[PDB]
Structures are given as C-alpha cells and as structure tokens.
C-alpha cells in the first residue's frame, strides 16, 4: 500500500490541454494506490473527469474518486481529490472539517492488508503565510477525531509550506505536533520536496497512533524524484508540477 | 484549433 500526496500545480484544463503532460501524470498516479491531489483549480470537475478516464479505461472499478466541494474560505476555492483502488481500501465515512483558507477534509480507509485495520486521512494545503497559525489548530483536529471517530490511527499530510523562511526556530516549538511524541514528522528537513533545484521540505508527513507507528515501513517515506527516474529535463519536471511527490508505504 | 481541441 503506497500512500502519497501529490501537489499538482494549477491542475485543470490548461494542464490537461497538453497530451504529453497528462501522459506522465497518468503514469505517476498508477504507482500509488491512494493519492492525494491538492489545489485543484477546476470548478466544474471537467479536469477530474479527464484524469479519471485514462485510469478507468480498462476497468470501470480501477480508481474511485472522492472530490471535495469548493471549500476555499478565501477568494479562491480549490478542491481535494482522493483517488483510491477499491480492492486495496474502501471509503466508509467522510466529512468536512467540523481559521483556514481551505478547510481540511477527513476520510476513512479500510485497509485490510495492513496491520492498521482502520485509519483516517487528513488533507491540508496551508497558505504561505497561514502556516504558523494553522499548525497549532491541527492539534485540536486530532482530538476531535479521537472521540468523535474512536480511531487510534490518524494521518496528516499535505502542503504545510514548512521551512524555507516560512517557519523559523522561534516558531518551530509553537507546533504541538513537534513537541508531542505521538506526532512524529517523517520527512526530514534536509530532503527536498520541490521540483525546483532549491531544497525545500514543504510537504510534511505526520503520523499519529501507537499501532500506526509500527505500521509505516522504515525509510519508505521519501520524495519521489520523477525527473531523474523518468529521464526528463528541468523544464518538463517544472511543467508537470512545482513540488515533488511525497510517498509513504503502509505494511 | 483555437479553443476546444488542441489544434
């Protein structure tokens, strides 16, 4: 079970107009059973339908979609997408966040194969300036999932926009997740999670739950440098997205 | 083309 967060840049018809760009995207998503698609700029789900036909052309039940309704508190509203194979996991309960430009979304995956039977997934795309404010608020989100859902395993991922002058050492202790031993950050700050040559660990993988800590494969959480793996140029890598995917493996 | 299709 490969679970990854994909920070596609300005996803929509504009990126879907190029046929070659869609070809690489289709190849990337097939690698991970459960993939998170952030900052979907589409309004009528035209792009999502375009992205799903290539994945479901051989079988109507290869990839199911879980799309968030326009939820941007600010002027622009993006969408969260959850592409998952039904045979690997099954969605049971989803609900909107119940302080953010985009409210986080909570879903349930029934992973029978992995030793963590039930576990939740939280998707978030913080603003470049909100990050300091929202990171303390996410601590209150985890408490809500603990008693409303009675779920031991809770996962948080997305574009937290950490590091790279956004978060400094003065506010590095303001995070309850960093202080608490339950939420151990997986992605090291040294690793680069952006297609740009500059080092930026914008994406952070947060894992919570005693059963979930032994569930993650040791060392599997790492950025997926598709540019070198697929033998593409810097322009092609940037043309796909501005940030590298982050993938964690569940056993 | 100029809108719909790629041409």
């Amino acid at each position: 079970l490969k679970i990854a967060a994909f920070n596609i840049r300005t996803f929509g018809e504009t990126k879907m107009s190029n046929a070659t760009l869609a070809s690489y995207i289709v190849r990337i998503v097939r690698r991970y059973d459960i993939v998170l698609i952030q900052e979907v700029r589409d309004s009528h789900l035209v792009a999502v339908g375009k992205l799903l036909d290539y994945l479901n052309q051989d079988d109507p039940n290869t990839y199911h979609y879980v799309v968030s309704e326009p939820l941007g508190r600010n002027s622009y509203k993006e969408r969260y997408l959850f592409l998952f194979r039904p045979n690997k996991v099954s969605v049971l309960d989803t609900y909107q966040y119940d302080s953010f430009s985009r409210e986080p979304a909570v879903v349930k995956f029934s992973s029978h194969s992995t030793k963590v039977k039930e576990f939740a997934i939280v998707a978030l795309h913080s603003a470049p300036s909100d990050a300091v404010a929202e990171i303390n608020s996410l601590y209150d989100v985890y408490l809500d999932v603990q008693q409303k859902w009675h779920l031991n395993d809770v996962m948080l991922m997305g574009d937290f926009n950490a590091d790279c002058s956004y978060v400094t050492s003065s506010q590095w202790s303001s995070i309850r997740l960093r202080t608490s031993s339950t939420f151990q950050w997986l992605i090291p700050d040294s690793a680069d999670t952006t297609a740009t040559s500059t080092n930026c660990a914008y994406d952070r993988i947060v894992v919570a739950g005693s059963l979930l800590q032994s569930s993650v494969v040791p060392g599997s959480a790492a950025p997926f440098d598709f540019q070198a793996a697929y033998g593409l140029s810097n322009e092609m890598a940037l043309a796909i997205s501005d940030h590298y995917p982050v993938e964690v493996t569940l056993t | 083309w100029x809108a719909x299709c790629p041409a």
Partner: protein, 371 residues
Amino acid sequence: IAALVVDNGSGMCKAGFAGDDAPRAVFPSIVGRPRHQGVMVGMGQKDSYVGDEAQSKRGILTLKYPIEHGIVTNWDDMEKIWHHTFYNELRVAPEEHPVLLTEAPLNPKANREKMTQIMFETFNTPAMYVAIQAVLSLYASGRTTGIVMDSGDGVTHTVPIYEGYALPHAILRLDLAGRDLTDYLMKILTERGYSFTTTAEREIVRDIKEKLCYVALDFEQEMATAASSSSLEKSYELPDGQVITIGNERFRCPEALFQPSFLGMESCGIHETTFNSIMKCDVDIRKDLYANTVLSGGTTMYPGIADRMQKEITALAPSTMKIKIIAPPERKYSVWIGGSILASLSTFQQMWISKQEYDESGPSIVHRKCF
C-alpha cells in the same frame, strides 16, 4: 389546501405556490447518471443528480435532457426530476394539495395520458389539471384577446384567442426554437475557429447565446457593418480561462428565427408563422388580433426582438393598421405567472380532476374533462 403550479417544460422547470408573483424553484431540467463510481465528501453515493447539481459537476455526469421538442422521451428520469422538485426544492409533500401541470399544444395524446397516470400513482396527488402553455401566457397580461407567441426551448407555437374563445384550427406549431439555435451556434462558431462537441461543453455555448446574441433590424446592411468594423466584436471568458472574440456571428444565430432556411427546415419564419396563423382566423377579428400581440418564452428576450418583429409584420400586413407588439418586462416566467393566477381563481375550482373521476373510467379523463 393551496395549489401547486409547475411549468414542466424543456430547459428549465419553474415551480412554486399559487398566489406568488415569482417561482421559488427554477433550475435546469437536466438529470445525469455518473459514469465513474465515486462518492464526494459526506455523501452516500447518490444514484443521480437533478438540476443545479448536474450543472455544478458537469464534468463527471452524462447529461441528458428528458424533454425534446416538448415531448417526453423517457419516464424513468421524469419521475426523478419531479421527485426532486417536490421534496428537495419546495420541501413540501405533494399529497397534501393539488398540482397544475403545463404542456405545449398539439402534443401526442400518449404524452398527456402518461402525465396523469404518473401523478395519481407515484405521488397520489389529490387533483391535477393540464393547461395549454399558450393559454396561461395570456392570463399574465390580463387581456382577453390577442395571439400568444410562446417560443420556448424546443417548441414554438401561436394560439390566437378572441374574447376567451380559442381557435383550434388556427393553431400553428413550429419546432424551431432556442435549442436548435444552440446546436446551430456551434457550426457558425466552427467557422471562426472554436470547437464545441461535448454535452458538458455545450453549456458554454448557451452562456454565449444568452449574453451576447442580438437581433439586427436589417440583416443585409448590418452584415456589411460587422464585416468592416471591429465595434461589433465583444470578448468573452470561458470557464477554462481562455478568451474568445465574437464578431458577425453574434447576430447570425438569432437571425435563424426569422429565416429558418439556415437550419434546413422548410417551415416559414417566426414572423411569417404569426401572419399565417392570423390569416386562418375570421375577417372581423383580424383587426383586434393585430393590435394585441403577446410575446413569451425565453427566446424572446433578445435585444431588439420586438422592433424586428414589428417591421416584419408591417410589410406583410395591410397599411393603416395598428400593429402593436407587446413585450412586457418579466416575460421569461410569463407562462408560470399566469399559472398562479388561474389556480387562485375561484372559477377554476370546479374544473379540477379528482381521483374519483380518474378511477371510474381510467386515464382517458384528460381528453374530455381537461382541455
């Protein structure tokens, strides 16, 4: 206790309560079944979407209009769109109060038969009635005489009425309407260099027609003006993000209403069909009908449509005749507005079709008790 009024036409399905001056639930008459199985946030895998949901998620549903040229093709989804109106839009059970449906004239007798059968079985509505869409239009104006020009989405018809008496032999029905303009607008736009083929992207053309298309007072003269002047051009923004420019094709699509030879139909123009309908009437009532012409429907909201029609009839009609084209504001919902007036009237209370009448001799009531 109250009376339910529904204009179950093509394109939009207005609904509301009797006595109101405006419908409360207006939405596109589109029902779509999803192709890819996937549940949104906090949903329960809805089988189908009706109306506003289909428009907002047009990417992943197979949109299909259940009404074609004012004729119901499928009934499995007509039951769905009606069920959405009563419970999800108006938030009122239909079994409490009677309902009043509308239809176009000269529809097949099987269409009205199934409408009555569905109302009494699926919803068990206490009473129902079907009225010609043209007749209800005259009630909004409050007049007694005058032709009704109901040019809706898929059906255009004229029903001349004099002193509350209809003329069934003079009813003319023409299938040229707004929907055929939406399909024709694609071919003319293909000339400029834009492609529109999918039903999802069809609605993009519909927005172009509703906000830009206008009728010219002189086709030949204005064709020359638009061909050598950039003043007629008007930019537009697609939902995708691109920008297009519409030049002379702004007015050619609405011009098909007056010269249906463009669409290949051998039928005469919308101005010619009004003149032909009047000629079928008696000589004495021709003067009254000329002075009172009432427009209706969506496709009569184009700028300058009234002035163009007035010029066309004047050439055909004899001189020294007062030709007044009545184009009141708030005419898109004109058909529904008359439906509210008729329901509230005490005279109509004796012409409702009760379940007692339907049970004794079947659904054939709609042809004798109902007109």
